[PDB]
Design a binder for this molecule. Structure first.
Ligand SMILES: CCN1CCC(Nc2nc(N(C)C3CCCCC3)nc3cc(OC)c(OC)cc23)CC1
Ligand SMILES: CCN1CCC(Nc2nc(N(C)C3CCCCC3)nc3cc(OC)c(OC)cc23)CC1
Ligand SMILES: C[S@@+](CC[C@H](N)C(=O)[O-])C[C@H]1O[C@@H](n2cnc3c(N)ncnc32)[C@H](O)[C@@H]1O
Ligand SMILES: C[S@@+](CC[C@H](N)C(=O)[O-])C[C@H]1O[C@@H](n2cnc3c(N)ncnc32)[C@H](O)[C@@H]1O
Ligand SMILES: [Zn+2]
Ligand SMILES: [Zn+2]
Ligand SMILES: [Zn+2]
Ligand SMILES: [Zn+2]
Ligand SMILES: [Zn+2]
Ligand SMILES: [Zn+2]
Ligand SMILES: [Zn+2]
Ligand SMILES: [Zn+2]
Lengths: 266, 268
């Protein structure tokens, strides 16, 4: 009988607001050290991101940015965050709008109501060894629907650079066109597995800059997540049209659209 | 009577609030600039952010050993266990400090990350008797304590050479400058002292682009509660401004007062 061992107190090395421990109760695999944990996106070549402060769209708010006069919220029709920093129930979870958070050009304070993603991880997560999908990430607490979980962080690369990379299992497309590769450099999101019935959704967010070629990817719970539940987003059709050839989906859901049994039926 | 006219000039952007008071005159809270906690650009600066261009260390401890690569870049790490510059630190010609970064194998709480950890002392923007607004300590501050960074708009020497208001310029001696006139933090309000209690140190943290050192002020001696902060603006500042106004620091060591200018002119 295998018992669960704590093999890393924090894979983030103190860079997140909270520790992200690693456990393994399935096999002898030690803490993954085949990548560089980074808390924010990195560059390995000049991306020339527009960082000009005068190019920022910003609000003239003196309040906590909870009114309809907030220009930043208007950039997505309205601010989609409630008083608790959670996405509103009517938020389009299928085709989400671009979220424009407040920034350093806004007249408002750093603790206004339009600063959720820029404030970082608040929920307790754990890197753990799954039964059939290698490493995965699970909730250490109940997470209500619309809560910010974590950012998809990695190395920013061009569409051209992504097309010459051998290991394309940690790529996130920003559909100039750029990609986030978390193979060599990434955060806790590089470990999140694919679920055909996802419990998290990717949302394009803008904070310190508003260069539309480079949205930041924020994952929000798509529904209420129970304690001990594995996190999962939909990798999309590009990932599966390339990988189904080599392996099938092991999410074990009745709604599975990429398993060997799902393949045989279609 | 003293009046608290702003609870936080930084609008929650620093680790601690920086209130504004005025017990001297009717001057309202300054709003003729934009408070920013980190440097900005209003043109293409192209700061080298390439993570592979970062020199970094392989420490598995708290980077308190002489074997730390980042400390060696700085000759040695100059921070003690409490994050204060060592007594033997060169305050006249300070070395370039390379703090640890996102490429080092160490943790975010290692001993080589004082400046990137931000303001920890209680500061106050206040109205002075003779020099307009100033900044003072609301606590006693031991020698070698990190105070604040000189934050502003990054501009080239070419741009600094055509800007009209040069009263908030800090030269990074391609060369570049930090202009805190339109965009700046609490440091834009620090007055000149011929006998200063703070010193600027060039520091590298998230990038190691040598055109853009970040300017960190550290106390050059023990600072008492209520004491005004001041650094030496230097000879370029006073060689230009002495014609228009003289230094009011009041020190016996003053080199830029009407009396000091009168002595210098009769000499030359
Ligand atoms: C040769 N070989 C071709 C496919 C390439 N992989 C991928 N490319 C891209 N970009 C944008 C292409 C198309 C140009 N994006 C990929 C995205 C993937 O998952 C979202 C993903 O998964 C498996 C794979 C992705 C790697 C190099
Ligand atoms: C015309 N007029 C020429 C001088 C210029 N002022 C200054 N330039 C620079 N340059 C050119 C650097 C870069 C070389 N630096 C200045 C720095 C100053 O204080 C440190 C300072 O104070 C008063 C003034 C500075 C403003 C425009
Ligand atoms: C971004 S990585 C996720 C973390 C990965 N499990 C690890 O141990 O590094 C994606 C890879 O995990 C595995 N994986 C993720 N979701 C899966 C799924 N639904 N079914 C099967 N394998 C999956 C595949 O090996 C896939 O290429
Ligand atoms: C960077 S600003 C400092 C904050 C300024 N006192 C304010 O109220 O905005 C520098 C200017 O402050 C004044 N100043 C600073 N130190 C001074 C000194 N020792 N003597 C006289 N004026 C000084 C001069 O007007 C100088 O150009
Ligand atoms: Zn607003
Ligand atoms: Zn706001
Ligand atoms: Zn705003
Ligand atoms: Zn599936
Ligand atoms: Zn080190
Ligand atoms: Zn280091
Ligand atoms: Zn270190
Ligand atoms: Zn003086």
């Amino acid at each position: 009988i295998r018992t669960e061992k704590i093999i890393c107190r924090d894979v983030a090395r103190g860079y997140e607001n909270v520790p992200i421990p690693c456990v393994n109760g399935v096999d002898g695999e030690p803490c993954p050290e085949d990548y560089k944990y980074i808390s924010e996106n990195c560059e390995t070549s000049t991306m020339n991101i527009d960082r000009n402060i005068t190019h920022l769209q910003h609000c003239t708010c003196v309040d906590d940015c909870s009114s309809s006069n907030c220009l930043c919220g208007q950039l997505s029709i309205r601010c989609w965050y409630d008083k608790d920093g959670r996405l509103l129930q009517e938020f389009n979870k299928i085709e989400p709008p671009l979220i424009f958070e407040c920034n350093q050009a806004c007249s408002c304070w750093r603790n206004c109501k339009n600063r959720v993603v820029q404030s970082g991880i608040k929920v307790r997560l754990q890197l753990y060894r799954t039964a059939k999908m290698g490493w995965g990430v699970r909730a250490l607490q109940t997470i209500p629907q619309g809560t910010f979980i974590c950012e998809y962080v990695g190395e920013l690369i061009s569409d051209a650079e992504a097309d010459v990379r051998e290991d394309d299992s940690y790529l996130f497309d920003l559909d100039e066109v750029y990609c986030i590769d978390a193979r060599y450099y990434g955060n806790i999101s590089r470990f999140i597995n694919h679920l055909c019935d996802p419990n998290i959704i990717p949302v394009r967010v803008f904070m310190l800059h508003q260069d539309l070629r480079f949205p930041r990817i924020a994952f929000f719970s798509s529904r209420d997540i129970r304690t001990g539940e594995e996190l999962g987003f939909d990798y999309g059709d590009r990932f599966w049209d390339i990988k189904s050839k080599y392996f099938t989906c092991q999410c074990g859901s009745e709604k599975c659209k990429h398993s060997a049994e799902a393949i045989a039926l279609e």
